[PDB]
């Protein structure tokens, strides 16, 4: 894959910058190409089967996985709002502090 700086310039940035829904058509095409190139480069040296690819090694029962969206309590909402209105958050957004 070459050196890391080159790999980051050639694959990490192009593929990432075309996952966004606000990516321009040229970025989406450039990402699709880079992903095809990378996938063809790694393919001989990465062997990856999924469980759906081979039924021989038994089967699991069904999984139901759901995401529950909870509300903040009123005092939790106050605490959170006061923190995002805090000057610590101003220092964070102004670059004086790490986020």
């Amino acid at each position: 894959l070459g050196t890391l700086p080159v790999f980051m310039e050639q694959f990490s940035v192009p593929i990432t910058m075309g996952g966004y829904s606000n990516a321009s058509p040229v970025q989406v095409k450039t990402a699709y190409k880079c992903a095809c190139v990378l996938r063809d480069t790694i393919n001989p040296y990465l062997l990856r089967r999924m469980k759906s690819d081979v039924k021989m090694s038994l089967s699991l029962p069904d999984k139901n996985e759901q995401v529950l969206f909870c509300r903040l309590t009123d005092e939790q909402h106050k605490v959170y709002q006061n923190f995002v209105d805090s000057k610590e958050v101003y220092r964070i957004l102004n670059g004086e502090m790490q986020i």
């Binding site: 050196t3 080159v6 790999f7 095809c36 190139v37 063809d40 480069t41």
Partner: peptide, 11 residues
């Protein structure tokens, strides 16, 4: 450079 895949990373 691999013309089949388009790869040019290999050094």
């Amino acid at each position: 450079c691999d013309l089949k895949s388009g790869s040019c990373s290999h050094i």
